[model samples]
Target: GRENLYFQGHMLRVRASITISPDDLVSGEIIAAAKPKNSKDTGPALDGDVPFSQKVAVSNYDSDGYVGSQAVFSDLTFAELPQLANMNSDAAGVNLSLRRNGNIVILEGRADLTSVSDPDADVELTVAFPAAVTSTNGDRIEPEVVQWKLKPGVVSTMSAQARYTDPNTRS
Candidate 1:
């Protein structure tokens, strides 16, 4: 499974995809970022342009069905943004878990935007699973895709279960 998060202006965009190969190997990447608030703005500032910019890289690995990854920020100015600081903890308030019960796989994800105070902030998360989905709380954008409109001061949750077969296991 792979997930990505992009922060631009007052918008936070998240994308997630999952794949369970016939060989039973699962892999993907996750990225996340948050726009920084201008120091000159006293109240909630609404600007589409990014005042400052930098680049960073993070990576990780996990033995379980879940992928563990990290993120690296390049610029020192990133520290000036409180939102970015908050995201540094708990993987930017996003979590994905994979569990296998026999031939069935269960995927659960959660995104927390409770700390986001920007009223004009537009946040959307889209996720696609490898197998046919059996159940989910998010909107089914496609046969195997789900979408969630994350609102500020709220926690969005999505759950999906599907049947998958590992050729090697042959269960």
Candidate 2:
């Protein structure tokens, strides 16, 4: 265990925001970086009633949906999903993706997440938080956990969440 040392790990949120409408995720700045996806990583893909890997728009997304909410945590990269519980310390660069499996929405991949420091600068919104992600509203059903306060045609969504992380740290 000598290799394991407890360093001061502070979850710093460089940006925070949110929106309601499903389309807002793409149209807005906070949830904009998030990409549409399912259970697959693809390109030139279409939302033609099928599932595909969504992209985390670390560049186009930003939000503060974490305020007054539980702290979530995670270390899984956008390319990897580890086995763990849902906590409030994870980084999301992507969120809200529509994946239909033969008429059934798989809702697999995330539509919003945090972005990695790789040359890609993409987001990593884990649909399933293995770290300290959502503690209170994780189980809330659709339209159940509203964020960004009150706004017309807008409601907090699983398609969006705030990311607090050090862009220079190793994720």
Candidate 3:
């Protein structure tokens, strides 16, 4: 009991000045200062602290340069994959990509359509939403309908782009 009382007396000063309970945690501003990375920190000088809770732009790269969607988040980052699910037809193919620069999330999609029918007619391709994909002027891409005039046995390629901040939606 004497040792316990002695330890408690010593800890009293620390407990009074600092909180050790989980209740102190809150959704608060993030203080960030550093070199953001996945590699080993070999002593590069770190930056100054600032509010880092805002959106962060992060990406991955492959040997073939940039591949697939980019990602964004706070304390981390994620990507919005805007895809064209053309699984039924052999002539239809699609790819998706998402990139972020701060609060701006860049969404991208590409589609390849090969005309299987003789003298194929007009075809409308739909690109679905991930955080309300928008156009150059902030126009929302609802279903992202793209029209293509297909020719017989010809390969037609189409590309699309949009910007959104919300990373919660992706399909």
Candidate 4:
């Protein structure tokens, strides 16, 4: 038995691949892998079992790292730090919300699990940076390319972090 049940480590890891069919904004940014930020309310299914309210945030969006951008249902739109991840399928259930902090949008965002879309893309993206990147408040619009390609058989520094709800910890 364990006092605290939880695990924390790279749950999923995917390096940046090719931009096979990327748009304009999807370029340069790698579609790194990551775990879903939000979870679905699967307790007893009482009415709005899907709590989290899609975008029920009460944080100081004006804080550092909070990009003024709403969830994108998938990674492409939530490309804040170049790479990202979510436990949802079809991009649904997962997205980033734009919070206003003066004249800037926090770079990071909120995640949503139990997404509506199914048949995950096994989507490929660039490796995340060792540190988070900062983006100011501006025309926070997604790019066209919206996807990048990697070296047929190469690896990127971008690695996925441990899932937010892993029940395993090693000290």
Kindly list the per-residue Cα lDDT of model 1 for residues 1-171, writing each as its tens digit: 553433333543333333333234443223333333444222221221223323323443222222233333333231232333333334445565656656666667676778775554445555555656677777887767666676667888867666667444545
Q: Which candidate ranks first by TM-score, i.e. highest? A: 1
Give the per-residue lDDT of model 2 (tens digit) for 73-167.
Answer: 22233212211111112333233343323322223323222233323222223232212222223333333232322111222344323232322
What's model 3's lDDT at 116?
A: 31
lDDT of 4 by residue, 25-49 (tens): 2212212233432342111111221
**Evaluation by TM-score, superior candidate among 1 and 3:** 1
Q: Between 2 and 3, whose TM-score is larger?
A: 3
C-alpha lDDT score of every prediction, in listed order: 0.47, 0.25, 0.27, 0.25
What lDDT does model 3 reach? 0.27
Least accurate 10 contiguous residues by lDDT in model 3:
10-19
User: Which residue segments of model 3 deviate by more than 4 Å?
Assistant: 1-91, 96-107, 114-117, 127-152, 168-171
lDDT assessment of candidate 1: 0.47
TM-score of candidate 4 to 2 decimals: 0.20
Per residue, candidate 3 scores C-alpha lDDT tens digits across 12-69 of 0000010011121112111111222323322222122223324323233122221211
| Each prediction's TM-score versus the true structure | 0.51, 0.21, 0.28, 0.20
